[PDB]
Amino acid sequence: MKLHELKPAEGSRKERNRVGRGVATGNGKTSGRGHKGQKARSGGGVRPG
């Protein structure tokens, strides 16, 4: 190839999900968490088992 024309193999890359940036992305306000309770707090959730 050349250093100004290179392309990766097809299906190797995806852009990652940024969460919490406005309404139309689908993960805008509550950022996937749902509304309240212990699982919606930072560092929340409970230990496995």
Partner 1 sequence: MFAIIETGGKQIKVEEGQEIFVEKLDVNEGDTFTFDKVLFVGGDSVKVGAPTVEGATVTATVNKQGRGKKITVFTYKRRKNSKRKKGHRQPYTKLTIDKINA
Partner RNA sequence: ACCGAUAGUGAACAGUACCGUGAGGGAAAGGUGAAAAGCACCCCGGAAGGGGAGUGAAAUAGAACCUGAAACCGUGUGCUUACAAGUAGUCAGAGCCCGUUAAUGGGUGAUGGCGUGCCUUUUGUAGAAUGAACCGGCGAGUUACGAUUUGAUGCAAGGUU
Partner RNA sequence: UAACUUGGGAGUCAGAACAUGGGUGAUAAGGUCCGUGUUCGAAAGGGAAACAGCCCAGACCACCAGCUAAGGUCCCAAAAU
Partner RNA sequence: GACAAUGGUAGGAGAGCGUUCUAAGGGCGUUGAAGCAUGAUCGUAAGGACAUGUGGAGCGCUUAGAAGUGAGAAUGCCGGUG
Which residues are near Mg ion by CB under 5 A?
32, 34, 37, 39
Secondary structure tally for the chain: helices H, strands E: 0, 0
Distance separating alpha carbons of residues 15 and 22, to the nearest angstrom:
18
Nearest approach in angstroms of CB 24 to partner 1 is: 8
Q: Is 2 or 13 the residue whose CB approaches Mg ion more closely?
A: 13
44 forms part of the interface with RNA (CB under 7 A): no
Q: Is 28 or 44 the residue whose CB approaches partner 1 more closely?
A: 28
29 forms part of the interface with partner 1 (CB under 8 A): yes
Distance separating alpha carbons of residues 36 and 16, to the nearest angstrom:
26
Farthest-apart Cα atoms in the chain, separation: 54
